[PDB]
Amino acid sequence: AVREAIHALSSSEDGGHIFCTLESLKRYXXXXXXXXXXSPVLRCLASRLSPAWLELXXXXXXXXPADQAFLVLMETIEGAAGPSFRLMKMARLLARFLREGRLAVLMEAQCRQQTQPGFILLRETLLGXXXXXXXXXXXXXXXXXXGNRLQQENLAEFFPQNYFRLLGEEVVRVLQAVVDSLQGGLDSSVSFVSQVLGKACVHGRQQEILGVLVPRLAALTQGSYLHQRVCWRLVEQVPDRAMEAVLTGLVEAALGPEVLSRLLGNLVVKNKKAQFVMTQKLLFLQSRLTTPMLQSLLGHLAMDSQRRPLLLQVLKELLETWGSSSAIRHTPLPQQRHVSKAVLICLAQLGEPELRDSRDELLASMMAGVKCRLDSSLPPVRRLGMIVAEVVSA
Amino acid sequence: XXXXXXXXXXXXXXXXXXXXXXXXXXXXXXXXXXXXXXXXXXXXXXXXXXXXXXXXXXXXXXXXXXXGXXXXXXXXXXXXXXXXXXXXXXXXXXXXXXXXXXXXXXXXXXXXXXXXXXXXXXXXXXXXXXXXXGXXXXXXXXXXXXXXXXXXXXXXXXXXXXXXXXXXXXXXXXXXXXXXXXXXXXXXXXXXXXXXXXXXXXXXXXXXXXXXXXXXX
């Protein structure tokens, strides 16, 4: 039935015939059997739409000329696989003139279909696949597509910035949709989200990420608790761990907004394990920290208060870091910068009792450190540290 | 950084591989572990033997274990996906061989099965020529190898995977699927459908079908 019709349409077609065929999808009335069957049908039809591209410029149905283009937009009222193939043909080029129009269209259609885009991502959340690593691969490509369009460049138009905005809006939508109450308790929400998140980060830091983040943050913060926490939590990958490290720092740069909101973002979620891992990862390293001074401080604050004594360990850990010799021989001057920051935070908070025991270590530290740094070019840099410590346990 | 660069000593011989094992196993299971390793390795995908090394380091020295299965999985998958996403001749044929080795360590160590065999159905499907087969069984860690041999749901997964297609990956997937003889039955019907698609193919999907047809025969 379906297959036969498809073949017939692809082979030969008069005006009325073509019209009826197109209207086929509209009628549907075949549950999802028709859907999956037609998913394959439309895959073929999209290839047939490459052939339809030349048939669209062959003076076919002048009145409804955009309809068949709207039949391609009827595909755009479909599945992400097809969006899949949208990208496929996008890669495919060919239709130069017609494709320019196509992709132009594709793009704004897909502003709506990015909603639809990640509602198909949300639909994947609602659904599931055992061999879906390639779904993710495709998804990755789809994520990449904004930059793959850039990659395609060729003519090129609406940019990745807007990709920026697109992304932001999509996310928002998703989030709230999901929120529902909890009409979507499945974790795949977070899965897609995080997949995307990871991808995003990988793909691009600074601007993109941050902008998205900022808006998102604000909104989210303002109105969410369990849900907030959930998405946050949901965050993943190793690429995305440091992805998130970077993300977090992007958000740090997100400054005081980031501070209060990520006091709430840490309050959304710290959940032990990986958080701890990357916290110390970050602790160890590195580059730029005026943001983190503030960064450091607030981050610390948040996490520390989320889960007490984290700080303590870090503080304890930090003592060791103050040392030199090998380190005196080694490093650049960034380490010192880091050190200073640490000092400041440390001064700020703990228990009191803390002082005493840590003072054991402090004293120890102090002594060896003293020697080493007493040997500091930036003799005063080292001295400043001493004074801080001194103060700390007078 | 040093180590990374270093993996190319003029006098490799046996001492070299011994030491390869040494550094990989030196990583063992510390802090950054899998993650750190992964990072540097991913950068210069020129050293998946070191990937194997550290894979195996984790395999005989660790923690977070199904999580390490996941790490492994990630790296593994990545490797295959990139590498087998195109082609090679001198160096990267051997890179694929090295990938088989890292798959090995991983697979065995984790009994990972889900992660592992998503990547086996992937990686197994990768086999191709000579060395391929060798590596395949090796990584497979016989139990699961034969498990897959039995397996038909995985086969169906692969069937549709191939249906979507990409290139030669799909082609040889079908090839080894056939190799993995048992009893089509259901697969026979599925492949009839494949053929139909196969038949249809105007582009290189045409040669895909050619190889498929051979398999079918």
B192 touches A at CB < 8 Å: no
> What does the buried/exposed string (b/e) look like for B82-102 if buried means 16 or more CB atoms within 10 Å of the residue's CB?
ebbeeeeeeebeebbbbbbbb
CB-based contact A328:A289 (threshold 8 Å): no
User: How is residue A159 written in tokens?
Assistant: 């940019």
Using CA coordinates, name the residue in chain A closest to B156: A131
**C-alpha pair distances (Å), B75 with each of B66, B72, B87:** 14, 5, 19
CB contact under 8 A, A130 and B118: yes
CA B134 to chain centre: 12
Residue B37 CB-density burial (10 A; 0-12 exposed, 13-18 middle, 19+ buried): buried
Q: What is the dihedral of CA B105, B111, B114, B119, to 10 degrees?
A: 20
CB contact under 8 A, B157 and A133: no
> What does the buried/exposed string (b/e) look like for B107-129 if buried means 16 or more CB atoms within 10 Å of the residue's CB?
bbbbebeebbbbbbbbbbbbbbe
Residues 6+ apart with CB under 8 A from A127: A188
CB-based contact A189:A118 (threshold 8 Å): no
A137 vs B81, B119, B160: nearest CB = B81
Of A127, A151, A154, A129, the closest CA to residue A141 belongs to: A151
User: Distance between CA B82 and CA B74 in Å, rounded?
Assistant: 12
Which residues from A are below 8 Å from B35, CB to CB? Answer: 238, 241-242
Of A275, A274, A283, A286, the closest CA to residue A316 belongs to: A283
Residues 6+ apart with CB under 8 A from B140: B107, B120, B124, B148
Using CA coordinates, name the residue in chain A closest to B203: A47
User: Distance between CA A368 and CA A319 in Å, rounded?
Assistant: 11
Resolution (A): 3.4
User: How is residue B74 written in tokens?
Assistant: 């990630």
B158 touches A at CB < 8 Å: yes
- Does an H or E element contain B181, and which? none
Using CA coordinates, name the residue in chain A closest to B154: A131
Residues 6+ apart with CB under 8 A from A279: A303, A310, A314
Residue with tokens 């490799």: B12
For CA atoms A37, A39, A43, A45, the dihedral sign is positive
CB-based contact A42:A83 (threshold 8 Å): no
Cis peptide before A151 (omega within 30 of 0): no
Report the structure determination method: cryo-EM
First-to-last alpha carbon distance for chain B, in angstroms, is 51
For CA atoms A308, A314, A316, A318, the dihedral sign is negative
Using CA coordinates, name the residue in chain B closest to A88: B166
User: Distance between CA A337 and CA A181 in Å, rounded?
Assistant: 46
A238 vs B31, B71, B164: nearest CB = B71
A131 vs B38, B81, B118: nearest CB = B118
CB-based contact B191:B159 (threshold 8 Å): yes
A11 touches B at CB < 8 Å: no
CB-based contact A198:A236 (threshold 8 Å): yes
User: How is residue B35 written in tokens?
Assistant: 């993650």
CB contact under 8 A, B158 and A238: no
CB contact under 8 A, A281 and B32: yes
Residues 6+ apart with CB under 8 A from B139: B100, B101, B103, B104, B106, B107, B108, B120, B123
User: How is residue A152 written in tokens?
Assistant: 């395609």
User: Distance between CA A90 and CA A195 in Å, rounded?
Assistant: 23
- HEC string of chain A equals CHHHHHHHHHHCCCHHHHHHHHHHHHHCCCHHHHHHHHHHHHHHHHHHHHHHHHHHCCCCCCCCHHHHHHHHHHHCCCCCHHHHHHHHHHHHCCCHHHHHHHHHHHHHHHHHHHHHHHHHHHHHHHCCCCCCHHHHHHHHHHHHHHHHHHHHCCCCCCCHHHHHHHHHHHHHHHHHHHHCCCCCCCCHHHHHHHHHHHHHHHHCCHHHHHHHHHHHHHHHHHCCCHHHHHHHHHCCCCHHHHHHHHHHHHHHHCHHHHHHHHHHHHCCCCCCHHHHHHHHHHHHCCCCCHHHHHHHHHHHHHHHHHCCCHHHHHHHHHHHHHCCCHHHHCCCCHHHHHHHHHHHHHHHCCCCCHHHHHHHHHHHHHHHHHHHHCCCCCHHHHHHHHHHHHHHCC
Which residues from A are below 8 Å from B39, CB to CB? Answer: 238, 242
Residue with tokens 């692969």: B158
B71 touches A at CB < 8 Å: yes
CB-based contact A9:A18 (threshold 8 Å): yes
Of A301, A300, A292, the closest CA to residue A337 belongs to: A292
**Minimum distance, in Å, between the CA of residue B34 and any CA atom of chain A:** 9
**Minimum distance, in Å, between the CA of residue B25 and any CA atom of chain A:** 21
Using CA coordinates, name the residue in chain A closest to B34: A238
B74 vs A134, A137, A238: nearest CB = A238
